[PDB]
């Protein structure tokens, strides 16, 4: 809700930052085996459960 | 806001250092409102007489900032 | 006179039985009737709760400990007489 605790907003802020696509220059590195973010989340599909 | 019914009270409050600015408001009924912005209140004097209006306006201290409608 | 027998217990309709409504009728009449104030003489004593009888008379405003449905009970009156008798012989 609008009424949040500071602890909740911190966890939500980190969840937002982790819910981003991968930088493109990561994909060009030597020995790179990472192509797409395998930990992506959508707000309807998976819930954060905090 | 405060209403002042006495002209010399308006001058005295204008003389007081808390006075910051003054507004002269000319209404459609030929009644003027002399408003004085102080630290705490907007002091307003309703002068319905024309001749008392401009003698008061020239009575206001020169250092005070007087502003048109 | 609108009702012949039920009186105040006409508010209960046809329910709970005639005898139970009859016993309630005696007690409810006692419970709600106005009583003369023993302190100011006005007819101003009414029941606030079971055992508490308060007078609304101006200047008196006395509150009474009494019976559930009537201001004074027979047991209290009888024993008040005996206690008065006992104190006098002592």
């Amino acid at each position: 809700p609008s009424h949040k605790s500071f602890r909740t907003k911190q966890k939500l802020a980190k969840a937002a930052r982790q819910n981003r696509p991968i930088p493109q220059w990561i994909r060009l590195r030597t020995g790179n085996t990472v192509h797409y973010n395998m930990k992506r989340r959508h707000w309807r599909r998976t819930k954060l459960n905090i | 806001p405060r209403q002042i019914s006495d002209i010399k009270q308006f001058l005295e409050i204008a003389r007081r250092k808390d006075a910051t600015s003054a507004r002269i408001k000319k209404n459609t009924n030929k009644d003027v409102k002399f408003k004085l912005r102080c630290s705490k209140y907007l002091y307003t004097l309703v002068v319905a007489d024309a001749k008392k209006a401009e003698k008061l306006r020239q009575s206001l201290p020169p250092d005070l900032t007087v502003t048109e409608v | 006179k609108r009702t012949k027998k039920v009186g105040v217990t006409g508010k209960y309709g046809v329910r709970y039985g005639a005898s139970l409504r009859r016993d309630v009728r005696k007690i409810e009449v006692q419970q709600h009737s106005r009583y003369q104030c023993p302190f100011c003489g006005r007819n101003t004593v009414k029941r606030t709760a079971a055992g508490i009888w308060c007078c609304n008379g101006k200047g008196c405003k006395k509150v009474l400990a009494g019976g559930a449905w009537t201001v004074t009970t027979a047991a209290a009156t009888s024993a008040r007489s005996t206690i008065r008798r006992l104190r006098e012989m002592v």
């Binding site: - | - | 055992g51 508490i52 006395k62 400990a65 009494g66 019976g67 559930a68 449905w69 006992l86």
Partner: protein, 244 residues
């Protein structure tokens, strides 16, 4: 095979509802002034105690030792009015509402809120319309024989105190309730003891009386006193049974 309703009444939801209570109705603590003389108090207000059939009386006394007022919560006797003076002590008069030792009152005195033992501030004859009768005295043993509202005879110390008069609010049980709703409201301020399901209407896992194709007990409903907590149902240790 299940803990029965009687066993579960050890607290929790079966506790007393105590938010609206107006204080514990008690006599004055037995002090020097009330042991040797009398102390006078003023009845401030007669109040309704939720869950109690009798009214309470707020009585203000003076602290004999400090500049302060001590207000005591009494069980009101019939005839107590606001502004009345109530005297408590050995040398108190024999008037309705006064608190005197039972040894100082003549045989046949009607008393209420009587102390079982000297100093416990009132145990007997506390319910509405109930009272205790001073049967007699035994000065050599310092005891007083009294008649309790159940008709039993009891011996109390002559220094035990009792309020002269009958507890106010008498006749409260005469009126039929006419209603589950009014029984609901009466017990809503006392505890969770209502409504009551019969044991015969239960299942065998729930009660000794439960089970069977017809609603019956199957065994005698008069039970011993040595029986187990799950067994103490029906008529416990009944000497006589049935309506005379």
């Amino acid at each position: 095979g299940r803990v029965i309703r009687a066993q579960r009444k050890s607290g929790g939801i079966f506790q007393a509802h105590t938010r609206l209570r107006k204080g514990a109705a008690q006599l004055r603590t037995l002090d020097f002034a009330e042991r040797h003389g009398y102390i006078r108090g003023v009845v401030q207000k007669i109040i309704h105690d939720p869950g109690r059939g009798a009214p309470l009386a707020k009585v203000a006394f003076r602290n004999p030792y400090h500049y302060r007022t001590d207000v005591e919560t009494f069980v009101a006797t019939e005839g107590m009015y606001t502004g009345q003076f109530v005297y408590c002590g050995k040398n108190a008069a024999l008037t309705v509402g006064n608190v005197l030792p039972v040894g100082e009152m003549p045989e046949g005195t009607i008393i209420s809120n009587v102390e079982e033992k000297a100093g416990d501030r009132g145990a007997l004859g506390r319910s509405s319309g109930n009272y205790v009768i001073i049967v007699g005295h035994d000065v050599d043993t310092g005891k007083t024989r009294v008649k309790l509202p159940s008709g039993a005879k009891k011996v109390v110390p002559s220094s035990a105190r009792g309020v002269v008069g009958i507890v106010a609010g008498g006749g409260r049980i005469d009126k039929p309730l006419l209603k589950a709703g009014r029984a609901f409201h009466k017990y809503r301020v006392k505890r969770n003891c209502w409504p009551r399901t019969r044991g015969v209407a239960m299942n065998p896992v729930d009660h000794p009386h439960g089970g069977g194709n017809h609603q019956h007990v199957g065994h005698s409903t008069t039970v011993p006193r040595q029986s187990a907590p799950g067994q103490k149902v029906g008529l416990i240790a009944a000497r006589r049974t049935g309506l005379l």
